[PDB]
Amino acid sequence: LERNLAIMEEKQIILKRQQEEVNRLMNTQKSG
Amino acid sequence: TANVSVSDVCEDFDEEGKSVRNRIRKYSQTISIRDSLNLEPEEIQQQARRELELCHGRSLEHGEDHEESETSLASSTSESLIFSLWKPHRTYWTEQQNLPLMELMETEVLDILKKALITYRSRNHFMTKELQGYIEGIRKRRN
Amino acid sequence: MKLTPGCFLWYLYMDKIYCLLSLRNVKALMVYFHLLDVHHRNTLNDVLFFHFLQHVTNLNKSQIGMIFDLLDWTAVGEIGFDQFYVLICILLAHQDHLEDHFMYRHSRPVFELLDLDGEMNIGAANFQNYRFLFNIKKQELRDLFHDFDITGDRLLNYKEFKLYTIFCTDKSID
Numbered sequence A: 001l002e003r004n005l006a007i008m009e010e011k012q013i014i015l016k017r018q019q020e021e022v023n024r025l026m027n028t029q030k031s032g
Numbered sequence B: 001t002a003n004v005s006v007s008d009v010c011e012d013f014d015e016e017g018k019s020v021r022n023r024i025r026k027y028s029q030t031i032s033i034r035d036s037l038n039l040e041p042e043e044i045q046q047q048a049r050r051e052l053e054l055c056h057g058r059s060l061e062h063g064e065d066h067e068e069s070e071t072s073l074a075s076s077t078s079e080s081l082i083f084s085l086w087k088p089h090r091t092y093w094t095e096q097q098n099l100p101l102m103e104l105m106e107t108e109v110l111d112i113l114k115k116a117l118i119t120y121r122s123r124n125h126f127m128t129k130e131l132q133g134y135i136e137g138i139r140k141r142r143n
Numbered sequence C: 001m002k003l004t005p006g007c008f009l010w011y012l013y014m015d016k017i018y019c020l021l022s023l024r025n026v027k028a029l030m031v032y033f034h035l036l037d038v039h040h041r042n043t044l045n046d047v048l049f050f051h052f053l054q055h056v057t058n059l060n061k062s063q064i065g066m067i068f069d070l071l072d073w074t075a076v077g078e079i080g081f082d083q084f085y086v087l088i089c090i091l092l093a094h095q096d097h098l099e100d101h102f103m104y105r106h107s108r109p110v111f112e113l114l115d116l117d118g119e120m121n122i123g124a125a126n127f128q129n130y131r132f133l134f135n136i137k138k139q140e141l142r143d144l145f146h147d148f149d150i151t152g153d154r155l156l157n158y159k160e161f162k163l164y165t166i167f168c169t170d171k172s173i174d
Helices: A002-031 B020-037 B041-056 B065-074 B076-097 B100-121 B126-142 C005-017 C025-036 C046-056 C061-071 C081-091 C097-105 C124-133 C138-148 C158-173
Strands: C043-045 C078-080
Touching: A002 C158, B020 B041, B020 B076, B041 B065, B041 B076, B065 B076, B100 B126, B126 C046, C005 C025, C025 C046, C025 C081, C043 C046, C043 C081, C046 C061, C046 C078, C061 C081, C061 C124, C078 C081, C097 C158, C124 C138, C138 C158
Parallel strands: none
Antiparallel strands: C043 C078
16 A cells, blocks of 8 residues: 555656646746 | 869858858968968968858848857857868869869779679678678778 | 658658757668668668668677667568668767757657567566667666566556656656
């Protein structure tokens, strides 16, 4: 279970970084 | 002995439109002056580099292409390769602007090829292997 | 015909996946293949392939032999022009650091090239062969292997490989 918890946290952090990158790219697109 | 028409080596090939022919004349004059003054080869290359930069460095306001070219020339690796392309082009124009050898050289090239092909088509002998070695040697030296 | 329709489509894809398309890249590789192929069989014998890499990339002959085996999936004992063209494209100025980011992006398969077996799972030996082709510390390779191997089966499946490549690419861009 502990291993499961670690893997799901890492997956959620991957999703968080993807969302952050897309948001910054959209900001650059709009502001440019 | 380029054996390339003058009309090809100087089609004002420079991508920016500055004629090749005017650049050549400027370098020819610079070198003639510098030879009289006995400028060292390193100094000559530095001056020639600067003139290439300036030819591309004509006001950078007249099209973005000049800024990208001057910038590329500003770096050291690309500049060495760009300069070294234009230098032999300039040379080829000069020498062509100013046959038995070409016939000999073409003959030697075909003689070598016929032998290379026969060898490849033809087998576990040292001599065959030695020759294959020399052939790769000549092709690499030529390249 | 632009050196055939398929090559032109690959060139458009290469331009899309490369920041600089460059000038006559396909023609230069084709000319190199023609110089090696004096016979013009459209295939290159091992000696020609090994010599060209020694002449330009100065690669170890044993390393070139492993590269020849990976490129020669047909295993006919000869390298096809397309395989030779792909191999030069795979190196793409390998010494340059910028190429390493492009190398991580790989190609449309993005995992098939690493998986020599083709079973959809990459063996440790296949990773070691890739490490010989692309310089990476053995300890660093082990650390990357452990991070990808959540299962503990010591195999990389395609979805995990795609995610692992994406995470590294995002970190490199950052």
